[PDB]
């Protein structure tokens, strides 16, 4: 009863792109993180700030859950302080991060013969994204002196790029589903708790 909707975020049928990561709020329920990390292989579970062994015996004000899909080698960039294409122009975590990061290989779900190209990622931006900033602008990136004028060409490129998830890819490029739990402890009756 009144268990937090953790199932509809992790086991959701279709994930969002990393550039348009999906945030689901968790409040007014009890949380049981024992139905999350099912060990397995290649699955990563790293808690930054709050230790995992006490997650079931802690109370928080809110729990935000960000969800997206990346590749294997870009999993390590989803961490506080790290830099890279994803960490700079797609999804940035603050330095005072207090939460956890879960990731698991989803090659059987987000890959198909011929290629699943529905997942996108931002390649260029004028500046790095601040923590928890979401940019969904499809404006042509201008790397040169001439205004691109809505079209691209010489020193003008598109900011979005398709991943290309094939079942025959390497582990480093297979699609990985990532869910980031951010725990917020404000100044109100703490709603989300554990056993």
């Amino acid at each position: 009863t009144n268990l937090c909707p953790f199932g509809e975020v992790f086991n959701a049928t279709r994930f969002a792109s990393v550039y348009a990561w999906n945030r689901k709020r968790i409040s007014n329920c009890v949380a049981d993180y024992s139905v999350l990390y099912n060990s397995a292989s290649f699955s990563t579970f790293k808690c930054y700030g709050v230790s995992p062994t006490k997650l079931n015996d802690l109370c928080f004000t809110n729990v935000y859950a960000d969800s997206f899909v990346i590749r294997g080698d870009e999993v390590r960039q989803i961490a506080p302080g790290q830099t890279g294409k994803i960490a700079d122009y797609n999804y940035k975590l603050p330095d005072d991060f207090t939460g956890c990061v879960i990731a698991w290989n989803s090659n059987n779900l987000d890959s198909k013969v011929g290629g699943n190209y529905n997942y996108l990622y931002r390649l260029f931006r004028k500046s790095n994204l601040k923590p928890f900033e979401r940019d969904i602008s499809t404006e042509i990136y201008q790397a040169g002196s001439t205004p691109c004028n809505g079209v691209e060409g010489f020193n003008c490129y598109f900011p979005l790029q398709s991943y290309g998830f094939q079942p025959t890819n390497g582990v480093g490029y297979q699609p990985y589903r990532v869910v980031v739990l951010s725990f917020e402890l404000l100044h109100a009756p703490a709603t989300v708790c554990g056993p």
Partner: antibody, heavy 120, light 109 residues
Framework: EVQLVESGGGVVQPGRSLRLSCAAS????????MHWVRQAPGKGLEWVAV????????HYADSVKGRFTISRDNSKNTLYLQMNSLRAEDTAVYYC?????????????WGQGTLVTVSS | EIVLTQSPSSLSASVGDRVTITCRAS??????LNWYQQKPGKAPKLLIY???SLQSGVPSRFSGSGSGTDFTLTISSLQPEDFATYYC??????????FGQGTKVEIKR
């Protein structure tokens, strides 16, 4: 008061398996997470594995994830570590430790340890 | 992961002298670090938890302090019972819990 007694160490040849146990006494076992941490003679301290309270989404370490298996038993107040396909570099003195903290995790109480030598 | 580096790796001090050991982290871990004492053959013992908190039973001569990426354990008055190795371990980004390489305190004569 708080006592942790390890048992099960000995001789293992490469590829085989071995089970280690850790009997606790002096606290409510079902309320603390447990840790397995090894120390190779010559090297320093190395964390191996951790199990939550009661037993849930156990967290391992790399070069161990698919090989070892940590479990527990609140009835017998015992913590178990089943090592499979032991390699030469797993030879070490093993300790079991407790968890503590509001958030965070530090090892407040340790056991005397037990020696595991893996060689052909 | 997070790599911890102790300094120095070994030292030689006399009784009553103030001893200082530093521990550096590859990234900010706030105050989520602890210290352990281990004598040859015996099991480790907890000394300081969460940067600057003294564990019960530990004498007041030990004191930890730090913030950010650089922490430091100091012994105000070294004693013969303190001939042991000292490890720093961070507990911010877990798992895995990462230990230091160890700082062996040696009694001079």
């Amino acid at each position: 008061e708080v006592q942790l007694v390890e048992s099960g160490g000995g001789v293992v040849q490469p590829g085989r398996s071995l089970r280690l146990s850790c009997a606790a006494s002096g606290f409510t076992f079902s309320s603390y997470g447990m840790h397995w941490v090894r120390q190779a003679p010559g090297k320093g301290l190395e964390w191996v594995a951790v199990i939550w309270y009661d037993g849930s989404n156990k967290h391992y370490a790399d070069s161990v994830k698919g090989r070892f298996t940590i479990s527990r038993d609140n009835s017998k107040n015992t913590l178990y570590l089943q090592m499979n396909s032991l390699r030469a570099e797993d030879t070490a003195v093993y300790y079991c430790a407790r968890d503590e903290g509001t958030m965070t995790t530090y090892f407040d109480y340790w056991g005397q340890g037990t020696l595991v030598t893996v060689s052909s | 992961e997070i790599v911890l580096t102790q300094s120095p790796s070994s030292l030689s001090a006399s009784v009553g002298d103030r001893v200082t050991i530093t521990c550096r982290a590859s990234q900010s871990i706030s105050s989520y670090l602890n210290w352990y004492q281990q004598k040859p053959g015996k099991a480790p013992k907890l000394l300081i938890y969460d940067a600057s908190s003294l564990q019960s039973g530990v004498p007041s001569r030990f004191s930890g302090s730090g913030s950010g990426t650089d922490f430091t354990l100091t012994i105000s008055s070294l004693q013969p019972e303190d001939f042991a190795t000292y490890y720093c371990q961070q507990s911010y980004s877990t798992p895995p819990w990462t230990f230091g390489q160890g700082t062996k305190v040696e009694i001079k004569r």
